[PDB]
Subunit: 224 residues, 2 copies
């Protein structure tokens, strides 16, 4: 199967809302070893976001039910654990694609930042589901991926770039939800918003302004 066939299949899969299929297609495309285009990496990103997202959403419902409770608790525990291993296997899939192919072949700063954010995101999803000794090590890998991406984005992208903004958003969420550092989360979110607002005049600014809206909503929610 050549790359272009796989990418068209991935697009079919997307429209069918069959994201496992979509992920498998873009996994195999990535494994060919050629640097992905903007379109291709966005398809890889959307595919796995939906694949992991389903498990994350399920995990939240079941872990909550486990808290709100008997023999029902052991069942809810075991089901959470089943969902967790699915979730970990997906995260590790993505993370090894990032290490073996995506990050090394990333020829541009934009790309490097995109993939490092992605590395931060997927370690963060592991962090959500980690406990015991492992968690501190998982959280630090997330934070280092984000931090490197954060530095590169500050140096080489404008404040209104959607990838720079998107990074600010996710990194702020990392601080609030994983590190429980509300003040760092807010200051990071506020400066990203403010620096973007100050930028006068964005070429295709629909995505950028959407993230700005999400940044401010987070600020409103976190400030009571």
């Amino acid at each position: 199967m050549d790359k272009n066939e796989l990418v068209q299949k991935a697009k079919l899969a997307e429209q069918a809302e069959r994201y496992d299929d979509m992920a498998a297609c873009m996994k195999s495309v990535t494994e060919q070893g050629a640097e992905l285009s903007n379109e291709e990496r966005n398809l890889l990103s959307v595919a796995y976001k939906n694949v992991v997202g389903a498990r994350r959403s399920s995990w939240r419902v079941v872990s909550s039910i486990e808290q709100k409770t008997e023999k029902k608790q052991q069942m809810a525990r075991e089901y959470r654990e089943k969902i967790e291993t699915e979730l970990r296997d997906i995260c590790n899939d993505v993370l090894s694609l990032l290490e073996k192919f995506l990050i090394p072949n990333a020829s541009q700063a934009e790309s490097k930042v995109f993939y490092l954010k992605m590395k931060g995101d997927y370690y963060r999803y592991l962090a959500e589901v980690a406990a015991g000794d492992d968690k501190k090590g998982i959280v630090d890998q997330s934070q280092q991926a984000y931090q490197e991406a954060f530095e590169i984005s500050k140096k080489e992208m404008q404040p209104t770039h959607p990838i720079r903004l998107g990074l600010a958003l996710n990194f702020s969420v990392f601080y609030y939800e994983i590190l429980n550092s509300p003040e760092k989360a807010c200051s990071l979110a506020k400066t990203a918003f403010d620096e973007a607002i100050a930028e006068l005049d964005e070429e295709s600014y629909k995505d950028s302004t959407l993230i700005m809206q999400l940044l401010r909503d987070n600020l409103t929610l976190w400030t009571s």
Copy 2:
């Protein structure tokens, strides 16, 4: 225990993991005891979502296949993906249909249950008809129609016109006539008379069962849609 499987099913439902939910309720059904009303609805909801994901996907890919004139390679791809999805959908329908034949219908000890399961048999043959190849289609359509018809006979004799399962059967059977049999006049008459019969006996509507009035509204929405 049956009870543990049912609690797992409910947990799967909460997680929106419907394949798990379906697997649980399948094995409960396979224990051979008549399902409670709660268990019946869990099975139905489970498979509705399992089969529905494929139906929805099938409709998207089928639409793309027909809307692409130029690219013969893109059509061939869409076709092969349609067929992949079809075999998934057929296996689901066949599992449900075998559960209905082996366990659910023969053990149905009330008219309410038998109509429900017969309607369900009609629905899943209908879903097979949606995706059926020209040759096998006529036979699959007849199995769908016979299931619905028997369900329709029993509901007419045993159930009140305002009963949600009677109304629901009228809705689906009218949809069968319109979409599978291309018989809009039959579809409309079936829908109109079920609506009118419900309206005539509004006094015999029990306090528990909105459901009835929601389905009546759906019936009349189809009438006005199909009349235009």
